[PDB]
Amino acid sequence: IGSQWRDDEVHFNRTLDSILVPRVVGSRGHQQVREYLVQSLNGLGFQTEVDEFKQRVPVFGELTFANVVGTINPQAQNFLALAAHYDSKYFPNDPGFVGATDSAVPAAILLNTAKTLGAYLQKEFRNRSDVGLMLIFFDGEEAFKEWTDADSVYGSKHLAAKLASKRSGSQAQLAPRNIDRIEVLVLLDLIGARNPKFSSFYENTDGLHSSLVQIEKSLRTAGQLEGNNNMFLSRVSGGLVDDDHRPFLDENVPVLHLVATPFPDVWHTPRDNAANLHWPSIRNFNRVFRNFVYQYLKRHTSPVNLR
Ligand SMILES: *[C@@H]1O[C@H](CO)[C@@H](O[C@@H]2O[C@H](CO)[C@@H](O[C@@H]3O[C@H](CO[C@H]4O[C@H](CO)[C@@H](O)[C@H](O[C@H]5O[C@H](CO)[C@@H](O)[C@H](O)[C@@H]5O)[C@@H]4O)[C@@H](O)[C@H](O[C@H]4O[C@H](CO)[C@@H](O)[C@H](O)[C@@H]4O[C@H]4O[C@H](CO)[C@@H](O)[C@H](O)[C@@H]4O)[C@@H]3O)[C@H](O)[C@H]2NC(C)=O)[C@H](O)[C@H]1NC(C)=O
Ligand SMILES: COc1ccc(NC(=S)NCCCn2ccnc2)cc1OC
Ligand SMILES: [Zn+2]
């Protein structure tokens, strides 16, 4: 029922602990988490590629960025893409900042979703070529000096450009851009705090949002959620929130932006740590989300077009 796909909090908790370290681009911690993501994706049976590049940024000068991408069914026609950022924000006066909600927990949720749905993804899901699953760990989401158009979302700008560029020849020029084979980028951000609220930011992905609303109602009615707070609202968002999806949105990719609004109390303060996470909210999100991903992939037949 809701009971087909069970929790694995042992896995969740270890995965979170392994990500939850200071990880400004260029730091020892960032390299530790980078390597951890590669190992983890490989062990969950993904084809793993690193989009590594050098770029000059405020304060630091030249840094080496690396987006980490896992794919199952790489030669599929189209893809569900799920994403989070793995860098943490630089704060002169808070080198210990771990960004628990931003976005250690979102990143751990992605790996844990692949784990809990492993029995599907290991076999039946591989027996097809219509749809694949991409897990994208963006690097350099966070501004180095102050958030602006230029000082932000560095890894995503770079991955979006890479996926957008074509190869030579008739066959390529008549074929889609790689980036156009993403049916929707589902970006998770600011998840971990008590009683988060997710509202729909884009009309074209509103039916996907409605599915989350529905899965939540179904699991609640079956007694499978903790507490009585509604996490997925059937409401449009207040204003838009700038994030890693922007460079993708700009190349016409549809976006489901699962960022909590209001932002967690602790956002961009030293208190965005494990002590301030709310595990029942994490578990509730995980249950809704793993079922959403499963259903999307299981119900997929023809290309999903939301452009
Ligand atoms: C992934 O990581 C997360 C984060 O680290 C882990 O989350 C933690 O999970 C643990 C264990 O499940 C949680 O601790 C447990 O909390 C229970 C609820 O406590 C609160 O509510 C109850 C009301 O229901 C209050 O009574 C409590 O107040 C008292 O305790 C607090 C906490 O120290 C004190 O500050 C207070 O002043 C009170 O004294 C809380 O408000 C709680 O039931 C449970 O208690 C068990 O263990 C204690 C000793 O630690 C025993 O005294 C007690 O007997 C309980 O033992 C169980 O088993 C024995 C049999 O041996 C039976 O006698 C009992 O009936 C009972 O079943 C424990 O404290 C913790 O809160 C939670 N942390 C966070 C931040 O969410 C996940 O577990 C982890 N997941 C995995 C898979 O590893
Ligand atoms: C504190 O509440 C808010 C603060 C700012 C904004 N607006 C924008 S456009 N934010 C860009 C966020 C980029 N990011 C995400 C994670 N780390 C950085 C909205 C907020 O609440 C609705
Ligand atoms: Zn942030």
- Nearest alpha-carbon partner for 249 in 60, 83, 131, 99: 83
Look at ligand 2, atom 16, and give the residue with the nearest C-alpha.
102
Parse the chain into domains and list their residue ranges. Answer: 1-307
Distance, CA of 194 to CA of 192 (rounded, Å):
7
Distance, CA of 79 to CA of 75 (rounded, Å):
10
Question: Is 52 one of the annotated active-site residues of the chain?
Answer: no
- Nearest alpha-carbon partner for 150 in 239, 56, 236: 56
**Most distant CA pair in the chain: distance in Å?**
57
Experimental technique of record: X-ray
Q: Is residue 165 reached through a cis peptide bond, with omega within 30 degrees of 0 on the bond before it? A: no
Sign of CA dihedral 268, 272, 277, 283: positive
Q: Helix (H, G, I), strand (E, B), or coil: what is residue 24?
A: coil
Angle 144-159-41 from CA coordinates, rounded to 5°: 95
Distance, CA of 294 to CA of 110 (rounded, Å):
13
Of 51, 87, 139, 141, which one is the catalytic site residue? 141
Q: What is the CATH number of domain 1-307?
A: 3.40.630.10
For the CA of 238, the closest atom of ligand 2 is: 22
- Nearest alpha-carbon partner for 253 in 78, 124, 108, 24: 78
Kindly write down the DSSP assignment for every residue of 140-175, as one continuous string: --S-SSS--SSSS-HHHHHHHHHHHPPPSSHHHHHS
Is residue 199 within 8 A of residue 233, CB to CB? The reply is yes
Is residue 300 within 8 A of residue 130, CB to CB? The reply is yes
Resolution in A: 2.1
Distance, CA of 186 to CA of 293 (rounded, Å):
10
Q: How far is the CA of 17 from the centre of ligand 1 (A)?
A: 19
Q: Which residue has the tokens 């896992």?
A: 70
Choose the residue to mutate in 233, 241, 261 for probing ligand 2, maximizing ligand atoms within 8 Å of C-beta: 241
* Runs of H (alpha helix) within the chain: 9-19, 28-43, 105-116, 118-121, 154-164, 170-174, 206-221, 246-249, 279-299
Phi, psi of 281 (to 5 degrees): -65, -45
Sign of CA dihedral 198, 199, 203, 206: positive
Of 51, 87, 183, 189, which one is the catalytic site residue? 189
Binding-site residues for alpha-D-mannopyranose sit at 56, 62, 122, 126, 277
- Nearest alpha-carbon partner for 104 in 277, 241, 287: 277
Report residues near ion ligand 3: CB below 5 Å.
102
Phi, psi of 143 (to 5 degrees): -60, 145
Sign of CA dihedral 99, 287, 182, 78: positive
217-238 as b/e, with b when 16 or more CB fall inside 10 Å? Answer: eebbeeebbeeeeebbbeeebe
Among all bound ligands, the one having the nearest atom to the CA of 263 is: 2
The verdict on the CB of residue 243 being under 6 Å from ligand 2 is yes
Distance, CA of 121 to CA of 111 (rounded, Å):
12
Binding-site residues for Zn(2+) sit at 102, 142, 268
Question: Is 141 one of the annotated active-site residues of the chain?
Answer: yes
Q: Burial, 92: exposed, middle or buried (Cβ in 10 Å; 0-12, 13-18, 19+)?
A: exposed
Which CA distances in Å does 279 have to 117, 177, 226? 20, 40, 10
Is residue 44 within 8 A of residue 122, CB to CB? The reply is no
For the CA of 280, the closest atom of ligand 1 is: 76
